[PDB]
Amino acid sequence: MNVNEFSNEFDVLYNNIMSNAAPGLNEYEKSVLLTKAQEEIVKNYFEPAGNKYGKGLDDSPKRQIDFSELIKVGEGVLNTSAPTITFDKRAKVYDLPADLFLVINEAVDTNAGTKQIVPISYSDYTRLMSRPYKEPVKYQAWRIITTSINNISVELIVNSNETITDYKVRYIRRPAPIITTNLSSEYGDVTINGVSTVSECELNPIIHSEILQRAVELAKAAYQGDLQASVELGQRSE
Amino acid sequence: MNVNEFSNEFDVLYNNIMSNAAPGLNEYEKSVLLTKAQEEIVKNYFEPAGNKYGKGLDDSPKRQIDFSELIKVGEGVLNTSAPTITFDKRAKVYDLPADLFLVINEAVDTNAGTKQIVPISYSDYTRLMSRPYKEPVKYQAWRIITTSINNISVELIVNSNETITDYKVRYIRRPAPIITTNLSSEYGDVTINGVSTVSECELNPIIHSEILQRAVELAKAAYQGDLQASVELGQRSE
Amino acid sequence: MNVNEFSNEFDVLYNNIMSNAAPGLNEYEKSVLLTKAQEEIVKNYFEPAGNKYGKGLDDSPKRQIDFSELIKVGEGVLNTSAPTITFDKRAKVYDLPADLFLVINEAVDTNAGTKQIVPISYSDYTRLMSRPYKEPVKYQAWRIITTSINNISVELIVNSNETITDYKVRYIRRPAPIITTNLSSEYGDVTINGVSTVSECELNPIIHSEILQRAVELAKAAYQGDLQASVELGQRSE
Amino acid sequence: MNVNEFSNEFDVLYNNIMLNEYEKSVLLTKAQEEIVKNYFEPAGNKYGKGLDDSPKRQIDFSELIKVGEGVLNTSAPTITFDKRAKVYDLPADLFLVINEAVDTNAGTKQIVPISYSDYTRLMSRPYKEPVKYQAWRIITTSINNISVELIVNSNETITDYKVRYIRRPAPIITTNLSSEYGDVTINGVSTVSECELNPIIHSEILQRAVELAKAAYQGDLQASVELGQRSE
């Protein structure tokens, strides 16, 4: 469904049938609520505990097809542009793509073959570095986030006497906002995520109805406006 | 039941018998609610936890016959049209049909015979690639979604020294909207999913009554219009 | 009970005894509600979890006699009329009868004798095709629904070097609507399922009273007309 | 209605279906000023409806609504009650303000006419600036004109100040007053003056003038005080 259909069925589901009908929502408000509902839905469906099914990214066909249009593959750029201080002397710093929402798969291609990057926790890092070896298992590499400015910088730890040729990252692209109409105005240009032009929902049509329902629920919680509704509907932001 | 019958029995079940009868619903509103009810019903019945029976796509004769008219078989087109970056060096990119709602069965015919495609999760992918072999079992192939624009693109991983001849996908077609009347108007053409012409329900007649009941429930929740009803009836969007 | 008796006892049970009697229902409304009640009753009684007894199609003498008048035996027509794309290279496409509600028994007569068709699920299909043999057990055949337009098309998989002579389907016929009076009018012909003429209930007289009670309950839920009653009485649509 | 029609149909209503023209002019001018106030305030009239509360009220004030710019009062170096207040003079022919906006470098901002109580309340807090799309306004030392302090947010400059207001009505005069009456003026004009208002409210102005005449000529104190209630 295109943006006009988002807005028309938003109006239908919000106030065109309600008995003591409420004021219609302005297009900026509808775009804001739709973008919020989109992000909430993405976060709810990525995490199993966030939805009533207990199903995350790839726990069912529907969850695969939900994020299928939001998956992207890119590469981390070696961060030798400027000097820096790494926590580990034997780690190579890489910069992830700017439009990164969530990392789901990483791999590094070295001279000793491809290796799956395992994101190790800080307590896990301490445990592993208290051991005599201090290097990954055969077909794996280690990873920790380092000092990041304006984009995520990442330290890749591989086994000794190994060089990294490329660093691929299969991630979830940051969703683009849903903007119903050109938000340009003479009184001031308002933006949802830095863009005023019309922006279609760049995800699969399977969850457009879900985004619409969530947006309507958020609109009605805003209309109710007491602390109660804000608190319970803020639980699903996550 | 054709579209006229959808609308007439919608009117019967909505406001023609109700004591303090409500305003009749316009045909655009009825078409919108019917399309929403259709999608909600499809998602509820595909997933066992979404309905009170706990029965999914093929858990009973009724669930088979429900989606029987919505199943389609097509092929993935090899994506050598333009270059791209694949997460796996040894994966062939294929494009699924545009009108895809849910994938239920995939198979690939290679020079070594037909092989069932197993959609592997990202954590499952990492586990499998940490192993020495890194290839499917005998009569199977692996699959992961890759960078997709305007349609789902898919990476097929098969065993070494194997070529893919065709890639069949048994999926669930995207339901067409239910539109009662030609939505063309002089004041502006409104569309449900990009189509203004009359559109019959293209599913089996077994669930037409179910779609009608769901549409009436959604209409009455819209009429009630408080946050409560929107929140509980948004649970079954799923 | 004929249609006049359906309508007269509908009036008796609806508003002729109720103290603050409601408006009488028009014959189109009574026919619509009776058809809805008929379909609801059929779906409730076919499935054990849908009724309070936990008894399905053949779990008791009453359930047998309920559908006894709605069972039909027909044949699937070989779909060599036009080309198509089958998911399985070794499957023969057949078209089921148009007036099919639910399949309860299938059998195929081959040159190697009669074989019971087992409807295999998609996950079951993947499991079976990951095995070395990939063919049914001795006295059975496999079946999956394929691309269907306007009627269910079915793929029959039998063992190698076997030809199918006929494909019998014992199913439940689609119930005909209950229409009390000729719905022809000068202001517009209204139909329940494409028919305006009088239509008797074509099921056993054992469940006519049940259909009447359900229709009256639906009428009173429509009269009450709030979201509550619609939601709880929509649970038994199923 | 032309002024001749006003004078002639005053005689029909006041002289029992048929006063000096100066006296008629005085009452008609007084009547319109009453009618404008009564139909502006919702509580002043019988319907409980103010300026924009119905289609009739919108056409009533339609020909009085005027849009003008305020001019910076940089000529006189007076003293403002607020540090960041820019003094602006309003139009001379101003009766009632209904919308004010200020065009800053940051953007147009709707001016809120802030009461003396709200100022002390909002200026007793940490930040002490308006909300991001509004400006405050309080009247200041005014000489034969209206001067307003525009308290816009600091770090911003005012480039424009538009005022939408009700223009002061012109007098209704039915004859050249200097012809028979020496130097009498109604609001500084001695010559024939037409009604500058929509014809919809001419009847109510005429009816009010007739009531004012009859109460004035009856001479009873009760009548004078009773009909003086509607003077505001």
Author numbering:
A (entry chain E), B (entry chain E), C (entry chain E): 1 to 238
D (entry chain F): 1 to 18, 25 to 238
Give me lines lifted from the publication on this model.
Virus ΦcrAss001 (Kehishuvirus primarius) was the first representative of this order to be isolated in pure culture from human faecal samples. Here, we present the characterization of ΦcrAss001 using cryo-electron microscopy (cryo-EM), enabling de novo structure building and elucidation of functions for around 1,440 protein subunits constituting the virion, leading to the identification of a novel ‘crass fold’ in the distal part of the tail.
The barrel was reconstructed by imposing C12 symmetry to a resolution of 3.20 Å, and with C6 symmetry to a resolution of 3.30 Å. The barrel is composed of five stacked dodecameric ‘rings’, termed ring 1 (R1, at the portal end) to ring 5 (R5, at the muzzle end). These structures are formed by four paralogous ring proteins: R1, R2 and R3 are encoded by genes gp43, gp40 and gp35, respectively, whereas R4 and R5 are both encoded by gp34. The ring proteins share highly similar folds and consist of two domains, with three structurally conserved α-helices and a β-sandwich domain. R1 and R2 form an interface for interaction with the tail fibre docking hubs, which are the point of attachment of the tail fibre appendages. Each hub assembly is an A2B trimer that consists of two copies of THA (gp38) and one copy of the smaller protein THB (gp39). The C-terminal segment of THB, residues 67–107, extends into the neighbouring hub, resulting in continuous interlocking ring of 12 docking hubs around the barrel. Each docking hub, in turn, interacts with the trimeric tail fibre protein gp22, accommodating its N-terminal residues 1–26. Unexpectedly, well-defined density at the inner surface of R1 and R2 of the tail barrel corresponds to 12 copies of an additional α-helical segment of the same protein, gp45 (residues 214–245).
